[PDB]
Design a protein around this ligand. Structure first.
Ligand SMILES: CCCCCCCC/C=C\CCCCCCCC(=O)O[C@@H](COC(=O)CCCCCCCCCCCCCCC)COP(=O)([O-])OCC[N+](C)(C)C
Ligand SMILES: CCCCCCCC/C=C\CCCCCCCC(=O)O[C@@H](COC(=O)CCCCCCCCCCCCCCC)COP(=O)([O-])OCC[N+](C)(C)C
Ligand SMILES: CCCCCCCC/C=C\CCCCCCCC(=O)O[C@@H](COC(=O)CCCCCCCCCCCCCCC)COP(=O)([O-])OCC[N+](C)(C)C
Ligand SMILES: CCCCCCCC/C=C\CCCCCCCC(=O)O[C@@H](COC(=O)CCCCCCCCCCCCCCC)COP(=O)([O-])OCC[N+](C)(C)C
Ligand SMILES: CCCCCCCC/C=C\CCCCCCCC(=O)O[C@@H](COC(=O)CCCCCCCCCCCCCCC)COP(=O)([O-])OCC[N+](C)(C)C
Ligand SMILES: CCCCCCCC/C=C\CCCCCCCC(=O)O[C@@H](COC(=O)CCCCCCCCCCCCCCC)COP(=O)([O-])OCC[N+](C)(C)C
Ligand SMILES: CCCCCCCC/C=C\CCCCCCCC(=O)O[C@@H](COC(=O)CCCCCCCCCCCCCCC)COP(=O)([O-])OCC[N+](C)(C)C
Ligand SMILES: CCCCCCCC/C=C\CCCCCCCC(=O)O[C@@H](COC(=O)CCCCCCCCCCCCCCC)COP(=O)([O-])OCC[N+](C)(C)C
Ligand SMILES: CO/C1=C\C(C)=C\[C@@H](C)[C@@H](O)[C@H](C)C/C(C)=C/C=C/[C@H](OC)[C@@H]([C@@H](C)[C@@H](O)[C@H](C)[C@@]2(O)C[C@@H](O)[C@H](C)[C@@H](C(C)C)O2)OC1=O
Ligand SMILES: CO/C1=C\C(C)=C\[C@@H](C)[C@@H](O)[C@H](C)C/C(C)=C/C=C\[C@H](OC)[C@@H]([C@@H](C)[C@@H](O)[C@H](C)[C@@]2(O)C[C@@H](O)[C@H](C)[C@@H](C(C)C)O2)OC1=O
Ligand SMILES: CO/C1=C\C(C)=C\[C@@H](C)[C@@H](O)[C@H](C)C/C(C)=C/C=C\[C@H](OC)[C@@H]([C@@H](C)[C@@H](O)[C@H](C)[C@@]2(O)C[C@@H](O)[C@H](C)[C@@H](C(C)C)O2)OC1=O
Ligand SMILES: CCCCCCCC/C=C\CCCCCCCC(=O)O
Ligand SMILES: *[C@@H]1O[C@H](CO)[C@@H](O)[C@H](O)[C@H]1NC(C)=O
Ligand SMILES: *[C@@H]1O[C@H](CO)[C@@H](O)[C@H](O)[C@H]1NC(C)=O
Ligand SMILES: *[C@@H]1O[C@H](CO)[C@@H](O)[C@H](O)[C@H]1NC(C)=O
Ligand SMILES: *[C@@H]1O[C@H](CO)[C@@H](O)[C@H](O)[C@H]1NC(C)=O
Ligand SMILES: *[C@@H]1O[C@H](CO)[C@@H](O)[C@H](O)[C@H]1NC(C)=O
Lengths: 150, 204, 204, 46, 150, 150, 150, 150, 150
């Protein structure tokens, strides 16, 4: 097997995959949800059609839970030091890239639902930029699924 | 910035000093003196276990109280002119109060798993009591910080929903959906925290 | 004056210096640094060498009652994580007459290229003394006011660079520093907020 | 028999941390104090 | 073969190629995504052709995705310490220069679509500056492909 | 041959040459790219002539590339510690001097292009100052060549 | 000869002589070059008369280049620790004294060309101050030649 | 003779005697060089007489040159640890006391030539305070010659 | 005698008694030297009666130069570690308590000469506060004497 301290890096790979992707999902819901609650007084009709920047920030939360369940179930007493460094680098790669994909949903989703309240022609353009900011968390997932499942 | 110059003056002088020290342990072969093995094994697992219980509840009620004063200044600030807010907009307070319920539950679930032993050798203290020490640190960190982020997330949305209820009273039941998605982040930290301490047993 | 130096081939082998080798049986303390590193004629009975196991036997024939011998057991393994060769004093043993002391010696390790050096390798555990007995009511006690031993890479009949025992940090400091420098972050978070609760200028 | 080690005392981690965490605790107390007297702003037009 | 902690630097090249290029692709998407919602309130015709500064930020993310798959598929237990340092610098090269390229696409893609709203003649000039700020991610790619494949 | 840690200082010369010259080439393209969008709204004829301060910032990008390939092609398993330190100071000397040359291009290229919108005679004087900020990245190139080739 | 780590301090004198004199020459041409653009709107005649603070800031860059070639040609595999300490202090003496001289040229050369826009009598006085900020790099040169050529 | 690293502290006193004294001589020239420009638009006749506060700052640089030449001529391989500690304190006490003396010259020389424009009677009073701020660099000279030559 | 590094703490008491004291003498000269330049435009007769805060602050440099001579004359080869720590505390208690007396002269002497222009009655009161602000530099001297004689 591995040394006695070997399970420290796989634990910090299950923590940082959920902590750093909770900060992206909390920023993407609070920064854009500030924009929802302020556009709604002037346009109370598009209040439900503009929820979708906060359900896209919630996918970043479940991108980090898929790997934090995968790591915390494959972790056992005394894994090798090679296998725990893999699951540390699989934890930082989806957490810190979900933190970037949660920032770029918060800043786009806030500005998008203000430009949609002033002009409804932006809604097809807003949900097209929001895919480009949401695949950044998917690129971190498909390389955390490569690293953890070695 | 006056005081942030002090916090950035220490953070720069810490990592510039670790840059110099780091290129002086390798460069005159003293790598062997670093010993991250000796740091992780000669520090007591009761230190990592009680920084997990100490941060599960305290960092949850940091974010539970950070989310209360953000939206509680918008209840009383927005409810001077429209005092119908103070009874309908209390479920924003409850949604950041429930993230401290997840703290005190997951602080006494983790605390039931810490039990004393008598060994002192890192070979006598096996890699079950070391894994139990690290997994209690990493479960109070993923339930303390994930509720510190969820509690401010349902406070910033709750402060915006309390200022939209002041203008139109029909808008609050639709911005309540955004606080549901925000309060699901705190429940996701509890699911990871019960899976990090599922197969954990400490003691001998 | 000079260190003890064992050799089997034309090349020299294991060599050991101290400044005050002293032992005690019961409560009678007898100093032995005048019979060891100055007398130049020691009874090194079996001083083994095998490039992975080396023994240093010192026998004195004038001690507490009878002929009493001291054994220094060393080993030299290849550790896979560090990818090096680390020597370790295995145990140090004393055989008086039909009895074995079995003084355990962890923290007397180091890489095989370098030598060891410490200031107190005494017995009688107070906080961190490196020679610990196997059972705690131990009749034997010994004390080195200086210490320098090398095995497995002795070249040109002299010591190499020394892997010292002291270090910048001890394991009791690392736990006390990770606690003090953590609630210093809690204090300067709670002091930054009270340094910014500024009052008003005018009243109505 | 040559090449003896340099004789560091046994309490070297104690004296290192007593000096280090005082001389940067008395330097940060000194830097913060001299920063506040340098930027005093007495108020001077008259 | 090499030590057990040799795989630490090899998974910090799979992580830093993905987290630093997603933090560059976030700044190219978010900062230039506020520029779209600020210009589309007056010019709703130039929405679908202003996705070019956030499309070119999305290629910075897939530069780091390619290197983080090349590093993670060339991982074994007990790799040498020399090959471990190559993949660490292959993550820092495509990572920290893709972060520099994402900083520049975010600035000239935000300010470019502000001047394109005030004048339709800047659309060819803004694209040429976007090419110079997107070969910075390409220059980091060809050093990451050289270093990781030695 | 050299020790096992020796190859870390040569990959951190191949990486620091690329990521510090890209940070200089990004600041020359970002700051002098917003000078184009503020100039063109009154004088749109000099748009293509104003691509020069982002062209001269783009040569600093390849001053660091031609030694990041030069260091990464002299890499060997077991290079000496003297050979490995020469390539560290060849990466830190074309990087941090190319970062300085890109810092100076983005300041005088932004202020110069904003200056030729109201005075067209400045353009032959702005292009002369950009030569002086260009050779700061060239002086770091010819001293990184005499360090790598030793 | 000397120890194996001895050549580190001489390489960090060859690179610090370059990157600190290129940062002084960056601040010399960028801070003074942004004053040429503000002078040009009212006085477009003295554009070529105002490259003198930019020319004398480029002299600081070739002061650091001469010492950095002189240090990098005095390097051998296995120099003494005394000789490589001489060239570390020969790199700081022309780097960090060229960074001071280039900072002083950029400050008085900025205010000098904005003062000659409103009064051309300052032009014979502006150049006379800049020689005093020029010799600070020259004093750092002639102590770097003394320290290195021992 | 002394240890191998003993020459490190003597050369650091040879560099800091020139680094910190040129940083004071530059601030005395740069801060009092902007005061010439603000004086120039009112009193053009006082140009050549106001080059005195940057002449006085020019002697701060040669106070550090005659200590850095003095240390770098008495350097020898194998100087004792006591003799090199004397030359570290000889360069710190002539550089950092010339940095303070150059700070006070640049402040009373800047404000002194502002008040000389509005009133010519201050010029004999400004030249008195420039003397008292000059001897702070001369007091550091006479304690550098005590420590270095002994 | 003492160890070879024992003479380092005594030369750090000879340097810090001159560095930290000429920094306090520079602040009392610079902050009050702008007090002379702003006062004299209104009341140009008091430029010889009012330079007494500059002359008073020129003694803080002399109080430190005196201690830096008693320390640098008691330096011999092989001083003990006990006797060298006394000269370190004699160099900080006269340098950093001269930095205090240089603050309180520079702030009082600045505002004291503005208030003497508008009213000549303050001259007896302003010179009385400079008595209490200068004895902070004298109290540090007589505790540097009581340490250096041991
Ligand atoms: C090395 C290089 C490091 C740094 C170099 C740069 C440093 C300069 C920064 C100065 C800091 C500063 O500004 O002071 C500020 C705070 O001052 C205080 O109130 C004290 C804060 C605690 C510090 C005590 C340190 C002791 C540590 C010992 C620990 C023992 C623990 C034992 C328990 C003054 O506040 P301010 O001026 O109002 O600024 C706000 C301005 N604003 C309101 C406009 C926003
Ligand atoms: C810069 C950093 C240079 C140091 C990194 C090199 C380490 C790799 C070399 C190595 O193998 O480890 C060495 C220890 O290495 C250390 O002990 C240094 C670690 C210090 C902390 C680094 C923090 C960097 C901060 C960055 C600040 C940025 C701040 C921005 C925010 C051990 O080497 P070795 O064991 O002697 O040799 C192996 C031989 N063997 C294989 C036969 C055993
Ligand atoms: C600036 C403030 C800095 C202050 C540092 C001053 C401390 C001097 C203490 C000397 C002790 C020492 O280790 O000597 C060392 C000399 O190495 C040097 O003297 C290099 C000086 C380090 C400064 C690096 C900053 C430059 C970064 C840009 C020799 O060490 P060693 O004897 O070779 O031990 C290794 C032996 N072994 C390889 C066998 C394991
Ligand atoms: C976070 C992660 C930091 C990096 C992961 C470290 C993994 C732990 C392995 C380790 O260092 O300890 C091993 C190597 O001890 C050494 O001294 C080898 C070099 C030290 C670590 C160098 C990496 C620095 C990177 C910094 C970049 C940031 C312990 O060695 P061992 O095999 O247990 O044998 C020792 C013999 N004994 C048991 C008698 C003592
Ligand atoms: C700013 C500029 C910064 C630049 C400053 C740079 C100063 C560092 C330069 C020293 C490096 C070379 C010195 C040397 O001789 O080598 C030594 C390197 O040993 C060390 O690394 C000493 C530092 C230990 C860790 C201290 C961390 C505190 C950081 C807190 C930061 C908080 C900051 C808040 C403010 C080798 O040691 P050794 O061979 O093992 O011998 C020791 C004896 N012993 C074995 C008994 C232990
Ligand atoms: C206010 C600023 C001042 C701050 C000063 C901090 C520096 C103090 C360190 C000096 C005492 C260290 C010490 O005795 O270790 C003790 C830990 O005891 C602790 O826990 C020390 C933690 C210090 C925190 C202080 C908070 C205030 C235990 O000793 P040991 O190290 O485990 O024993 C090993 C024996 N040996 C040391 C001989 C090897
Ligand atoms: C502003 C700066 C002001 C200066 C402020 C400096 C503040 C730093 C204070 C550090 C004091 C530690 C010294 C000490 O405790 O003694 C230690 C050694 O003694 C020495 O070796 C002396 C080394 C001093 C190096 C400082 C030079 C930095 C100046 C660079 C500036 C250049 C700037 C140019 C640009 C004892 O420890 P030890 O473990 O027993 O060692 C014995 C082992 N040995 C025998 C092998 C040595
Ligand atoms: C950033 C802050 C830096 C602070 C960093 C501090 C580094 C920590 C230093 C501690 C070193 C180890 C402790 C120790 O025991 O060594 C020595 C203790 O001697 C001392 O206590 C020296 C401490 C004085 C430091 C003052 C520097 C401040 C100067 C600033 C003025 C600047 C003004 C410039 C203008 C004893 O030596 P030994 O080897 O243990 O004894 C055994 C040998 N024997 C058996 C032969 C006797
Ligand atoms: C929404 O995510 C879409 C694709 C995704 C996820 C691609 C990633 C894998 C991306 O990682 C990378 C960049 C690759 C890439 C290149 C994608 C281009 C995508 C589409 O482009 C075809 C856009 C869409 C922008 C584009 O189709 C626009 C409709 C448009 O066609 C309008 C044109 O007027 C405009 C000029 C043209 C230009 C800008 C490309 O884009 O659609 C999509 O379905
Ligand atoms: C090739 O790049 C030019 C210089 C470069 C890069 C020099 C480097 C090698 C450098 O290492 C240094 C700076 C060499 C150096 C010191 C050149 C000095 C002036 C150049 O001349 C030779 C000017 C100069 C001809 C010209 O640019 C100005 C228009 C002017 O001729 C017109 C005059 O009104 C003006 C007052 C006069 C002053 C400024 C010298 O110069 O140009 C250049 O092209
Ligand atoms: C630029 O060339 C001059 C000096 C240079 C380049 C010096 C350095 C390279 C360095 O080598 C030198 C050593 C710096 C230094 C130690 C200069 C000393 C004195 C000179 O002598 C006053 C003035 C002086 C001749 C003159 O420039 C001033 C105009 C003037 O002196 C003349 C009068 O206008 C004015 C009334 C007078 C005042 C204040 C009374 O100032 O240096 C020059 O000229
Ligand atoms: C060993 C002791 C070292 C630690 C001591 C730290 C104690 C700090 C004491 C005082 C620092 C506060 C000084 C700053 C004054 C605040 C000025 C203001 O807020 O107006
Ligand atoms: C040690 O070496 C010497 C010199 O070769 C030899 O005479 C002696 O016999 C050796 N010691 C033993 C115990 O053989
Ligand atoms: C230490 O050695 C001295 C002489 O070397 C001796 O007098 C003393 O008794 C020894 N210490 C003890 C505790 O025996
Ligand atoms: C060396 O001797 C020890 C003890 O006698 C033995 O266990 C070991 O196998 C030997 N090794 C070799 C290589 O002979
Ligand atoms: C050895 O045996 C004798 C026999 O009585 C006893 O007195 C003595 O104490 C023994 N030696 C030791 C060291 O105990
Ligand atoms: C103590 O020594 C015995 C030798 O019989 C060994 O088996 C045991 O592991 C040692 N224990 C420690 C903690 O070193």
């Amino acid at each position: 097997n591995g040394p006695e301290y070997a399970s420290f890096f796989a634990v910090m790979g299950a923590s940082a995959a959920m902590v750093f992707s909770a900060l992206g999902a909390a920023y993407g819901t609070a920064k854009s949800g500030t924009g929802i609650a302020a556009m709604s007084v002037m346009r109370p009709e598009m209040i439900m059609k503009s929820i979708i920047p906060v359900v896209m920030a919630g996918i970043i939360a479940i991108y980090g839970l898929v790997v934090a369940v995968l790591i915390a179930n494959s972790l056992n007493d005394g894994i090798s030091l090679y296998r725990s460094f893999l699951q540390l680098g699989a934890g930082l790669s989806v957490g810190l890239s979900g933190l970037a994909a949660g920032f770029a949903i918060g800043i786009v989703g806030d500005a998008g639902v203000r430009g949609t309240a002033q002009q409804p022609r932006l809604f097809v353009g807003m949900i097209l930029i929001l895919i480009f900011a949401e695949v950044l968390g998917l690129y971190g997932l498909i390389v955390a699924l490569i690293l953890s499942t070695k | 910035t006056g005081l942030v110059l002090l916090y950035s003056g220490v953070f720069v002088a810490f990592w510039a000093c670790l840059l110099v020290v780091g290129i002086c342990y390798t460069i005159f072969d003293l790598g062997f003196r670093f010993d991250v093995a000796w740091f992780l094994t000669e520090t007591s697992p009761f230190m990592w276990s009680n920084l997990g219980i100490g941060l599960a509840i305290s960092l949850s009620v940091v974010g539970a109280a950070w989310g209360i004063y953000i939206t509680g200044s918008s209840i009383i600030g927005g409810g001077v002119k429209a005092p119908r807010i103070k009874t309908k907009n209390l479920v924003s307070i409850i949604f950041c109060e429930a993230v401290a319920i997840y703290g005190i539950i997951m602080a006494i679930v983790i605390s039931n798993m810490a039990e004393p032993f008598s060994a002192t050798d890192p070979k006598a203290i096996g890699h079950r009591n070391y894994h139990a020490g690290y997994s209690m640190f990493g479960a109070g960190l993923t339930v303390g910080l994930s509720n510190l982020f969820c509690g401010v997330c349902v406070g910033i949305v709750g402060s915006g929903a309390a200022l939209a209820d002041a203008q139109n009273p029909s808008l609050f039941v639709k911005i309540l959906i955004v606080e549901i998605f925000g309060s699901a982040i705190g429940l996701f930290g509890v699911i990871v925290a019960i899976l990090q301490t599922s197969r954990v047993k400490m003691g001998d | 004056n000079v260190p003890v130096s064992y050799n089997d081939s034309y090349d020299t082998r294991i060599l050991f210096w101290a400044q005050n080798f002293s032992v005690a049986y019961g409560e009678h303390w007898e100093d032995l640094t005048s019979r060891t590193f100055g007398v130049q004629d020691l009874n090194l009975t079996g001083s083994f060498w095998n490039d992975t196991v080396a023994r240093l036997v010192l026998t004195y024939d004038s001690l507490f009652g009878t002929m009493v011998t001291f054994k220094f057991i060393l080993a030299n393994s290849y550790y896979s994580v560090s990818a090096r060769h680390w020597f370790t004093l295995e145990n140090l043993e004393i055989h008086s007459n039909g009895s074995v002391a079995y003084f355990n010696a962890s923290q007397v390790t180091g890489p095989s290229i370098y030598s060891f050096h410490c200031e107190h390798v005494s017995s009688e555990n107070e906080d961190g003394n490196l020679l610990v007995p196997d059972t705690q009511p131990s009749l034997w006690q010994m004390t080195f006011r200086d210490f320098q031993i090398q095995a497995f890479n002795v070249t040109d009949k002299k010591f190499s660079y020394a892997s010292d025992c002291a270090g910048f940090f001890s394991p009791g400091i690392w736990m006390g520093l990770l606690t003090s420098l953590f609630m210093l972050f809690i204090f300067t978070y709670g002091l930054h907020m009270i340094l910014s609760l500024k009052t008003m200028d005018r009243f109505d | 028999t040559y090449n003896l080690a340099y004789k560091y005392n046994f309490e070297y981690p104690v004296v290192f941390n007593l000096v280090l965490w005082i001389m940067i605790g008395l330097a940060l107390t000194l830097i913060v104090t001299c920063y506040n007297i340098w930027n005093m702003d007495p108020g001077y037009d008259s």
